[PDB]
Amino acid sequence: GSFTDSPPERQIVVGICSMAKKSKSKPMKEILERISLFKYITVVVFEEEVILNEPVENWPLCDCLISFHSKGFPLDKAVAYAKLRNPFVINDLNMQYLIQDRREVYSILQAEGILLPRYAILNRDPNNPKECNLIEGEDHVEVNGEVFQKPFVEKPVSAEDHNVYIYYPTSAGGGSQRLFRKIGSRSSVYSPESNVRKTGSYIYEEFMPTDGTDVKVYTVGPDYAHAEARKSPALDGKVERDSEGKEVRYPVILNAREKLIAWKVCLAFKQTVCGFDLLRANGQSYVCDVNGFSFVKNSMKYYDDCAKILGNIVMRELAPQFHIPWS
Ligand SMILES: Nc1ncnc2c1ncn2[C@@H]1O[C@H](COP(=O)(O)OP(=O)(O)O)[C@@H](O)[C@H]1O
Ligand SMILES: [Mg+2]
Numbered sequence: 001g002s003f004t005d006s007p008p009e010r011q012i013v014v015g016i017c018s019m020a021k022k023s024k025s026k027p028m029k030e031i032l033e034r035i036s037l038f039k040y041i042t043v044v045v046f047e048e049e050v051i052l053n054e055p056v057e058n059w060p061l062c063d064c065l066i067s068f069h070s071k072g073f074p075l076d077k078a079v080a081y082a083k084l085r086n087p088f089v090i091n092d093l094n095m096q097y098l099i100q101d102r103r104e105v106y107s108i109l110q111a112e113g114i115l116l117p118r119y120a121i122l123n124r125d126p127n128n129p130k131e132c133n134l135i136e137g138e139d140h141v142e143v144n145g146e147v148f149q150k151p152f153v154e155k156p157v158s159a160e161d162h163n164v165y166i167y168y169p170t171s172a173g174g175g176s177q178r179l180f181r182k183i184g185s186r187s188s189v190y191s192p193e194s195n196v197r198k199t200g201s202y203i204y205e206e207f208m209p210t211d212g213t214d215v216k217v218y219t220v221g222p223d224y225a226h227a228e229a230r231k232s233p234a235l236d237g238k239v240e241r242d243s244e245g246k247e248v249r250y251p252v253i254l255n256a257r258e259k260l261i262a263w264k265v266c267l268a269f270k271q272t273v274c275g276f277d278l279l280r281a282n283g284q285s286y287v288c289d290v291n292g293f294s295f296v297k298n299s300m301k302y303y304d305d306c307a308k309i310l311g312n313i314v315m316r317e318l319a320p321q322f323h324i325p326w327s
């Protein structure tokens, strides 16, 4: 007789809501076609034009929503769509405003008792730039009373501004290293300027001496974290590439203390899929950056695991109200 596995048939609908840059990227396509393998799950990718120009009432329906902010994304709308349709939300939307502010990110990490660099916030009133309390010496700064000896790190308050400066002490040749979002072959450049920036609000923080690499961590729920290291952008300024122009990736195995950081970051920020940075310095591991939704690129295993985990999260959560058989 018939061998056909009969249609469910109410599929659980997973909606993907993000800018087309992200929704159509290779890592996204790899992960979604694997999620589509789940018998009871169908993936609806929200068109960018819909997201941008249609009110939320005409956005397609879903049972589970994967949505995340990137440049130009209408987060207000994503949030009103979530309130309207009450779907199961994978990466919390309101947390994503906070993730855009480095002050908020650091406040959350502090409150969760996660090791991060010693730091101070200089808020500059754009109309009274002199008022703000900053005192600068040759090899130090004083922000809100607290003192930072060069080498120190200076970060724009907006987490979406990647113009992070690190200041060299007199004995290292002076000047600064200017980090910026990498296009081209440079990740940073030397500058002879020794005085800190004079407009804008910044976080000043202690420089964590590492071995010249950054540990990049990518979570998929609290019990899964992939890690790899990359050359610190402040080092050569040169991006290292391999055979095929792919950046070079150093091996990392997270220790127990670090697996717990990943578990806590994932939950504290309410982002199932979450990328953050670790600085392995002085026997410990400091989080310096939390970026929210992020895929690993060019890893078959990560694609398989990510899709398997997300798929299972959806099933576990929504199978019961649908009366779908699942353990
Ligand atoms: N406190 C620090 N000590 C040493 N290096 C740091 C420190 N803060 C950040 N860095 C270097 O600056 C790079 C960029 O800083 P990060 O906080 O990740 O900003 P971004 O959001 O633009 O990625 C980090 O990956 C790291 O290599
Ligand atoms: Mg970073």
Ligand SMILES: [Mg+2]
Binding pocket: 159, 289, 290, 291
């Ligand atoms: Mg960042």
